[PDB]
Amino acid sequence: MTEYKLVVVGAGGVGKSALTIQLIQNHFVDEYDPTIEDSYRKQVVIDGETCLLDILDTAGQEEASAMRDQYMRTGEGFLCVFAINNTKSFEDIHQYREQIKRVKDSDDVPMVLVGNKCDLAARTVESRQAQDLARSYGIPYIETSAKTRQGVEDAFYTLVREIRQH
Amino acid sequence: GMTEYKLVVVGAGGVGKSALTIQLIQNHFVDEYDPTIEDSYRKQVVIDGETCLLDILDTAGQEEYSAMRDQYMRTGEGFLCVFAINNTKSFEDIHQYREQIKRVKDSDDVPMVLVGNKCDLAARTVESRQAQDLARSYGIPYIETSAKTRQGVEDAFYTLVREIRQH
Amino acid sequence: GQMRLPSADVYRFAEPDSEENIIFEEGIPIIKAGTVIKLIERLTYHMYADPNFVRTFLTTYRSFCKPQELLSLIIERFEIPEPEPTEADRIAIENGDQPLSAELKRFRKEYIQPVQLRVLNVCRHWVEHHFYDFERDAYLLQRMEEFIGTVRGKAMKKWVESITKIIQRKKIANITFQSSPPTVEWHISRPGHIETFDLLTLHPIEIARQLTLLESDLYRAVQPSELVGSVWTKEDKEINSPNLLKMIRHTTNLTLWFEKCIVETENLEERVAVVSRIIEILQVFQELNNFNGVLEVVSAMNSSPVYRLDHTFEQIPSRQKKILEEAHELSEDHYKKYLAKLRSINPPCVPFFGIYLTNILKTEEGNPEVLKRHGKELINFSKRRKVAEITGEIQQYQNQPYCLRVESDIKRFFENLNPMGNSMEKEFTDYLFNKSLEIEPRNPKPLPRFPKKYSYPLKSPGVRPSNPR
Numbered sequence: 001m002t003e004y005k006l007v008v009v010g011a012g013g014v015g016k017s018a019l020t021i022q023l024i025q026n027h028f029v030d031e032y033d034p035t036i037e038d039s040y041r042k043q044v045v046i047d048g049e050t051c052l053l054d055i056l057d058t059a060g061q062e063e064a065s066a067m068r069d070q071y072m073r074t075g076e077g078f079l080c081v082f083a084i085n086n087t088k089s090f091e092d093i094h095q096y097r098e099q100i101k102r103v104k105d106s107d108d109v110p111m112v113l114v115g116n117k118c119d120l121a122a123r124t125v126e127s128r129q130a131q132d133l134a135r136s137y138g139i140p141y142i143e144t145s146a147k148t149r150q151g152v153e154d155a156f157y158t159l160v161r162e163i164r165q166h
Numbered sequence: 167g168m169t170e171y172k173l174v175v176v177g178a179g180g181v182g183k184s185a186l187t188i189q190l191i192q193n194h195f196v197d198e199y200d201p202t203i204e205d206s207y208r209k210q211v212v213i214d215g216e217t218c219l220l221d222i223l224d225t226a227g228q229e230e231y232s233a234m235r236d237q238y239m240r241t242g243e244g245f246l247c248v249f250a251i252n253n254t255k256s257f258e259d260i261h262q263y264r265e266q267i268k269r270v271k272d273s274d275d276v277p278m279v280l281v282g283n284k285c286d287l288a289a290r291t292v293e294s295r296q297a298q299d300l301a302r303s304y305g306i307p308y309i310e311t312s313a314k315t316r317q318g319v320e321d322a323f324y325t326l327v328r329e330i331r332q333h
Numbered sequence: 334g335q336m337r338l339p340s341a342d343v344y345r346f347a348e349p350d351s352e353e354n355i356i357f358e359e360g361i362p363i364i365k366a367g368t369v370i371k372l373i374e375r376l377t378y379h380m381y382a383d384p385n386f387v388r389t390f391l392t393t394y395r396s397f398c399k400p401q402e403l404l405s406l407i408i409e410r411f412e413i414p415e416p417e418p419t420e421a422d423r424i425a426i427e428n429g430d431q432p433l434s435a436e437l438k439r440f441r442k443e444y445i446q447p448v449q450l451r452v453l454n455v456c457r458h459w460v461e462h463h464f465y466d467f468e469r470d471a472y473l474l475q476r477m478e479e480f481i482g483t484v485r486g487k488a489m490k491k492w493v494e495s496i497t498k499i500i501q502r503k504k505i506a507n508i509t510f511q512s513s514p515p516t517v518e519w520h521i522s523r524p525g526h527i528e529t530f531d532l533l534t535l536h537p538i539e540i541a542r543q544l545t546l547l548e549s550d551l552y553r554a555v556q557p558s559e560l561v562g563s564v565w566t567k568e569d570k571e572i573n574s575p576n577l578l579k580m581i582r583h584t585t586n587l588t589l590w591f592e593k594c595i596v597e598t599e600n601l602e603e604r605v606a607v608v609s610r611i612i613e614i615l616q617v618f619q620e621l622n623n624f625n626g627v628l629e630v631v632s633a634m635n636s637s638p639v640y641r642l643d644h645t646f647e648q649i650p651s652r653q654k655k656i657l658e659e660a661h662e663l664s665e666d667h668y669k670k671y672l673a674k675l676r677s678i679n680p681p682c683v684p685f686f687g688i689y690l691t692n693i694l695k696t697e698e699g700n701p702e703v704l705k706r707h708g709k710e711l712i713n714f715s716k717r718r719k720v721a722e723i724t725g726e727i728q729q730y731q732n733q734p735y736c737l738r739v740e741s742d743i744k745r746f747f748e749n750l751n752p753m754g755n756s757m758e759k760e761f762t763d764y765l766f767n768k769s770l771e772i773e774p775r776n777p778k779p780l781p782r783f784p785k786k787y788s789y790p791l792k793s794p795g796v797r798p799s800n801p802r
């Protein structure tokens with residue numbers, strides 16, 4: 001069993017915790033309890049191979065912004081999450097992307113761009129704009145709903161595949 | 167190659183039974199243990215000049231899974247029946263453990279030893295004469311052990327191996 | 334250079350590391366042993382977070398620190414003094430200018446705020462995942478509410494208000510799937526006809542599914558508080574480990590029910606059908622990764638009353654013997670193949686709890702509480718990490734739910750199963766063994782014949798599921 005260290009990052013309130021708890025427990029969290037740092041573990045067969053996912057759920061609130069280097073050093077792949085009804089959270093994506101590259105001193109870090117809350121009709125970030133950004137990073141773009149489970153396994157397991165092929 | 171003996175530890179829970187096998191298998195001189203480690207329950211020993219391998223089954227902690235006892239017991243060639251010398255109920259349990267071993271092995275003469283274990287400093291309630299009398303009534307050896315000083319531990323296991331060899 | 338720290342005389346968590354207060358294992362450091370002050374310092378360290386440490390510590394700390402004392406210590410950790418103005422700051426103030434306060438601002442940003450946030454994260458995890466400390470000590474909860482509710486200052490405000498709400502919700506205190514669950518299957522017994530439910534009249538697929546839902550719920554209900562300190566083996570086990578004991582007693586009762594179904598079927602042909610049906614249930618347990626259920630069957634087939642029924646197993650088809658033998662091989666050599674299979678399957682699963690119990694107990698019993706170094710007694714934290722590795726493995730398999738529909742009547746039938754009746758254990762297991770001797774006497778006694786007891790067809794419907802539109 002190979003172990004994979006995944007980290008979920010993005011602006012406050014975009015649904016990092018709801019995505020993670022949906023993956024771990026098949027349950028949607030309605031509350032908005034801002035995270036400091038939580039860690040989860042999941043055994044799962046992906047492409048016929050059993051592995052062990054360690055998932056670090058991180059703080060999006062800006063008051064925690066000086067505490068990121070430590071978790072970026074240890075992570076092997078990053079889910080970069082914004083909410084498709086929050087354009088500021090999409091603009092915050094590039095700051096996480098650049099910080100990860102600086103900390104890991106690498107242009108080649110496994111990442112997936114995630115547009116969350118795709119169950120909501122009132123979108124403000126178009127899929128095309130997010131896809132253009134993902135292409136510029138060389139990474140896939142997956143739209144998700146922590147509420148309905150749409151795309152959730154695809155997002156996390158795509159990141160596993162990119163760590164595996166790294 | 168060398169003979170392997172499958173030994174099974176049985177007895178009441180909650181009264182320090184597990185210290186017997188831990189102290190045997192342990193790094194004798196470093197008080198440390200990881201039971202999850204492959205073969206933390208196998209030990210090569212020399213008994214009366216003859217080298218052998220002990221494989222010890224001690225399911226301590228699983229006492230409430232009472233319907234699994236038959237299956238666990240059938241794996242064994244010899245049995246340590248353990249009670250605590252400060253717990254009279256664990257001593258009174260010994261008769262039924264021995265009867266169950268005889269039924270599972272389908273034999274009236276199964277290699278076994280009676281072990282009286284001192285697990286703390288609380289007052290002894292089973293005197294050595296009581297346990298000697300019980301062991302003699304069964305025709306089996308009696309060994310007393312300390313859960314803290316390792317005294318008696320080797321004697322209990324080696325005596326059982328001698329019972330198997332002389333069966 | 335490194336930040337300067339408060340004087341260790343006013344703030345105890347600034348004492349330098351030494352071999353007299355902390356020992357590391359041989360890329361964050363791993364702690365082998367330390368004083369409680371050093372453990373709490375590293376639990377809330379300014380340089381890095383250790384989320385696994387928070388779980389380990391909060392699961393196991395009561396073996397070395399009381400809950401009331403832990404709260405006092407993390408409040409003491411939280412209240413960090415700020416440094417005095419530097420010489421450059423002093424000179425600016427003497428000129429009527431605003432000081433730059435560069436060192437003060439850095440110490441706030443890089444020491445106080447991370448430590449304080451990590452203290453609050455300990456509080457958040459304590460309340461969310463270890464709330465039993467507060468259920469059992471109302472005064473501890475009052476102290477936590479007062480501490481959280483009086484944290485001032487805007488940097489912590491979002492988490493202070495959140496933790497306050499989480500506490501209030503915990504005081505007065507839904508699944509979505511990738512697919513639909515399969516259709517409930519019926520055999521001789523029809524929906525609502527609970528009076529006819531029995532081993533051969535319920536559908537073997539549905540017996541295995543409903544027992545798996547029941548055994549999964551029982552597995553998922555066991556909390557670490559029932560395990561740490563080996564409390565399920567001690568005199569107060571009924572008070573401290575009730576969900577664990579309920580789970581084990583279900584397993585024992587089902588095993589005994591299987592045995593009773595077998596040996597109370599005195600006609601040989603009918604008893605073969607009973608054993609064959611139980612092996613089919615075992616096959617579905619295997620398909621569902623219900624390892625508790627697998628071993629319930631294996632335990633029954635290896636019990637003294639059942640194991641000796643040579644005439645019965647002589648008629649069991651080879652393909653079913655192969656299924657039972659492979660399941661039994663999981664337990665051989667100290668569960669070697671079971672451990673490998675558990676770690677390879679795709680959850681959901683229901684682990685066998687017994688191995689975890691033995692490993693927690695032996696880890697507790699086989700390692701010292703303290704290490705003595707340079708005249709000091711240090712808490713042996715490596716021992717607690719080993720226990721928490723086991724409780725964490727248990728928890729990892731408690732997360733994933735089964736995509737199976739509950740059938741309320743079948744669930745109730747298995748919840749109310751009571752093969753022992755009012756009999757004591759020895760009386761009942763002697764009864765089962767005497768029945769075994771009756772139906773298949775010891776050689777050279779001849780094998781008797783017995784009349785049939787079932788008026789319905791014995792043919793199994795099999796264990797491959799059906800799917801109408």
Ligand SMILES: Nc1nc2c(ncn2[C@@H]2O[C@H](COP(=O)(O)OP(=O)(O)NP(=O)(O)O)[C@@H](O)[C@H]2O)c(=O)[nH]1
Nearest residue numbers: 012013014015016017018030034035060117145146
């Ligand atoms: N409709 C909808 N709401 C969602 C979705 N994901 C999260 N939410 C909601 O958005 C809010 C914030 O979610 P949360 O998971 O706490 O976000 P977060 O990114 O972890 N916040 P933080 O960075 O502070 O820890 C919650 O009310 C949650 O129910 C989604 O996919 N759809």
Ligand SMILES: NS(=O)(=O)c1cccc(S(=O)(=O)c2ccccc2)c1
Nearest residue numbers: 038039040041388462725726728729
């Ligand atoms: N730290 S937490 O509050 O998010 C949490 C609490 C209990 C269990 C889990 S876990 O099952 O995801 C798990 C299991 C084993 C090792 C790591 C993680 C997570």
Ligand SMILES: NS(=O)(=O)c1cccc(S(=O)(=O)c2ccccc2)c1
Nearest residue numbers: 634635640646649654655657658661
């Ligand atoms: N030890 S076990 O759990 O695999 C088991 C128990 C009872 C019966 C069987 S059996 O019917 O497969 C069988 C019968 C006779 C000779 C070989 C095999 C297997």
Ligand SMILES: [Mg+2]
Nearest residue numbers: 016017034035
């Ligand atoms: Mg969050």
Ligand code: NA
Nearest residue numbers: 252253254291
């Ligand atoms: Na007593």
